[PDB]
Nucleic acid binder design. Sequence first.
RNA 1: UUGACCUCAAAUCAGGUAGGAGUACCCGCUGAACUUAAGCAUAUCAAUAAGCGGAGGAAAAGAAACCAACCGGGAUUGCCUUAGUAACGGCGAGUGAAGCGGCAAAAGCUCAAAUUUGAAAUCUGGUACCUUCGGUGCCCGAGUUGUAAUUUGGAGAGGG
RNA 2: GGUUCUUUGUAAAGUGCCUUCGAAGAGUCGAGUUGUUUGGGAAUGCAGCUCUAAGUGGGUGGUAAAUUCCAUCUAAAGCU
Lengths: 52, 99, 203, 148, 193
Amino acid sequence: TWRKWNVKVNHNEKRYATASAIAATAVASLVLARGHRVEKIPEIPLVVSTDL
Amino acid sequence: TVKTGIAIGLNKGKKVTSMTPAPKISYKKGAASNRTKFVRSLVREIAGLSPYERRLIDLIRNSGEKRARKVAKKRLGSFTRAKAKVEEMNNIIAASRRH
Amino acid sequence: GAYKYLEELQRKKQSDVLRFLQRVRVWEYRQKNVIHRAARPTRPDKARRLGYKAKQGFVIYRVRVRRGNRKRPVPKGATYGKPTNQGVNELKYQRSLRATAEERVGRRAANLRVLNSYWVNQDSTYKYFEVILVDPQHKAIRRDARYNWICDPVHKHREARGLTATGKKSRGINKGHKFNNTKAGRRKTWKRQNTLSLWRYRK
Amino acid sequence: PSRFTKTRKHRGHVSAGKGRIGKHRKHPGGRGMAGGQHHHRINMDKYHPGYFGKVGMRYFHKQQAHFWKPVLNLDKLWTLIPEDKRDQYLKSASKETAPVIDTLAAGYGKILGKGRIPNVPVIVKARFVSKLAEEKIRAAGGVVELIA
Amino acid sequence: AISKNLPILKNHFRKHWQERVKVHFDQAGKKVSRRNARATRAAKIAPRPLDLLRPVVRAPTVKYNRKVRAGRGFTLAEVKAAGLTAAYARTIGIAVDHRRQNRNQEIFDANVQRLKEYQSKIIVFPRNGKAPEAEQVLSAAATFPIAQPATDVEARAVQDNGESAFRTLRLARSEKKFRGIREKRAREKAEAE
RNA sequence: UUGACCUCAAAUCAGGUAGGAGUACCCGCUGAACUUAAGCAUAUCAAUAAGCGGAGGAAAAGAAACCAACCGGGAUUGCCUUAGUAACGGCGAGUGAAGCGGCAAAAGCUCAAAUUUGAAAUCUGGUACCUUCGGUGCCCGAGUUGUAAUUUGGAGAGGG
RNA sequence: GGUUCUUUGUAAAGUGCCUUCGAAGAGUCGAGUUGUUUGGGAAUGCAGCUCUAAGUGGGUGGUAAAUUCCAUCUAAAGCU
Ligand SMILES: [Mg+2]
Ligand SMILES: [Mg+2]
Ligand SMILES: [Mg+2]
Ligand SMILES: [Mg+2]
Ligand SMILES: [Mg+2]
Ligand SMILES: [Mg+2]
Ligand SMILES: [Mg+2]
Ligand SMILES: [Mg+2]
Ligand SMILES: [Mg+2]
Ligand SMILES: [Mg+2]
Ligand SMILES: [Mg+2]
Ligand SMILES: [Mg+2]
Ligand SMILES: [Mg+2]
Ligand SMILES: [Mg+2]
Ligand SMILES: [Mg+2]
Ligand SMILES: [Mg+2]
Ligand SMILES: [Mg+2]
Ligand SMILES: [Mg+2]
Ligand SMILES: [Mg+2]
Ligand SMILES: [Mg+2]
Ligand SMILES: [Mg+2]
Ligand SMILES: [Mg+2]
Ligand SMILES: [Mg+2]
Ligand SMILES: [Mg+2]
Ligand SMILES: [Mg+2]
């Protein structure tokens, strides 16, 4: 049971990857390559009203 | 008593307005009371002397203070208790010899 | 009161008055059973300051235990091992003769709980003890909250677990640097110091 | 991870990289620090000289908190001021208004003199100072204030 | 076996250490339990603020005496100077420590003043009244934070009196080192002739 | 002769209680050797396994005959750290804490030693009735070789 | 949240000043020796035997001892 299960990551490197992941959501080619059906979407990033 | 304000020396430490708190009661343990002095003095004449105390009384009269303290330190455990034992064997000898 | 005079008189153990009393009393205890009930404490001052109350539910027993070292109970003195464990004679039991006295009384009187015990006499062969016991089933003990704590199941056989005064002394239960091995129990301290503490995010 | 290890590459090979002659054994030279003076002596004298023997006097019950004295050099002395506040002190290197630096509150015991502070007077509150650190603070117009 | 140029390790694993391996798998489980325990105690003692007011004390030793932290409890002289008894203070969420003593006026003044805001910020419900609701505040430490004192000012005049603080340190320790020798010398110089 | 007292007995006396099981964890006793030291005896393994006694839902510890040496902290326990350090050790192999600091949780107290002495004011049991985890009255008993009130060192008591 | 028992009180408790006091644990502390144990090293704890206390005293202050101080607690009884 004392095998290492959880892995420590530097907080700034966790944040580094999160910022990269957010910026990758704005690239429609990456979103299309990831398997999403955004072929007929108006624009990326897709922003909707706060009423949602 | 007062600190010098510097980090080394005789009275090193920060200068602070002192307060001298009230003395506690626990800091009074051992202090003799009127009742307890009466009981310990009464028991001494009821019970009498120990065999080693009789020896110390004889050695004080015969061999002197130094030999009595050496035997008292052997019978007790310390040089400090040997002094207090020889001191109040001197008191018993002083009271017995007088009058 | 008279209990203060009894306390100061009991301290001068080598006076003529107590040399006679201890000589007569040590004879009486040899001629009685090794464990026997005492009708009253021969040291009522010492019993009081250990928590004895002169009321129904408090029992005094008297007990004598063989003095000396604990000879290793190996056949013919032969130990099977290294020379460091070949000692047989000069080996000492880790509990006081007072503690052995408390358990033997406690086993004889398993319906009671041992509160405390005190030395009364000794000769070359035995040390003599008087053990204060409290009845947890007696109604005079079950009410009167100053002593009904001992009616709890957690206090069954305190003398066997070393929870009495001599039991805690022999366990080493005292504060400070002199008792670092034994403050909360040395086996718990040893377990804690010999435990590998591994966190999910390894330090 | 296991899939990148040489154990995976040693599958199919008899000795798993340990040799047919050497024939990987339990503890061929002893366990741990065995034979540091006998059969591992050369390795000890080459790479750990000073290992065996005794050195100076013992210290029963050492409390490292007695010896706490973090040192701070003069080139880092001006880092104890926050940087936005720092510039208006570097300008107007004047007495009658000089920055007071409590090196103790920043966690330092002794101020050392690596040197070349600017020519701005500075009030230094220090538990200890080196002689040369005192010379350079006074040369800049400042003074060292002894505290405890 | 001793090997090539590596540091000497001291891995203490020559006992049955695998019988005493504690892996804190329950770290997430224990954190939820403490939060549930804190929520359970808060509802039980509502509107009391889950903890006692603690004094400000000077940390001991020379490494840490630059700091003030939260102490165990206010002294008997501190509670007295705040106009209340130790027995009553314990019942309104004040920690009272009988064994701590006051030898510092500024610590005592800070702790006495600390007691005065607390009495001015709490309301004690009547023992037999109607108990008006008081919108429970969970923390007493966060409501009365410990603040470090201001040792000096931002900037002031340079006052150089030619003391040479290093020389002051050298003379201070020299005076202590040779005091016992200089006291025998003074003793014998008066005794002789 | 009779009535106590003290000590010790007896009863299929009235009412109780103990044993044994479990024993992961806990409190103690007792206690190895394999093993390591490239041999081996001190050492190590290990104040461990086995053996034995005793509890609970936790246990133990616990409100300082503490830590300190500071501008002093302040019951116990546990975590991070101190620290593989101070220290111990054929000073070999190896072994090895504690203070401070930051957290979790926090909670404090009780007797003995005091003449109630113008009131043993204390308590068990039996019996009767009840509002029956108990209460009330009555009686026997315990208890002055000390049961209650009052005080526990942080104090506190008498008197004013 | 409410509803009786409201002589459920000079009964309990706390608070100021002065004065006299202030009882505080013994085959125990401590010491020697022996054995064991500890990181504890002129001896960390425990235990056996021998000695065996004082009361401005006692313990501790991690090098034995003597002399002079200083600091810090209040053991040898107990609950949580
Ligand atoms: Mg061996
Ligand atoms: Mg983790
Ligand atoms: Mg090949
Ligand atoms: Mg093959
Ligand atoms: Mg092969
Ligand atoms: Mg050779
Ligand atoms: Mg019957
Ligand atoms: Mg245990
Ligand atoms: Mg071998
Ligand atoms: Mg071998
Ligand atoms: Mg061992
Ligand atoms: Mg076992
Ligand atoms: Mg159970
Ligand atoms: Mg629990
Ligand atoms: Mg418990
Ligand atoms: Mg307990
Ligand atoms: Mg106390
Ligand atoms: Mg503490
Ligand atoms: Mg040793
Ligand atoms: Mg070991
Ligand atoms: Mg009262
Ligand atoms: Mg005491
Ligand atoms: Mg043993
Ligand atoms: Mg050993
Ligand atoms: Mg202090």
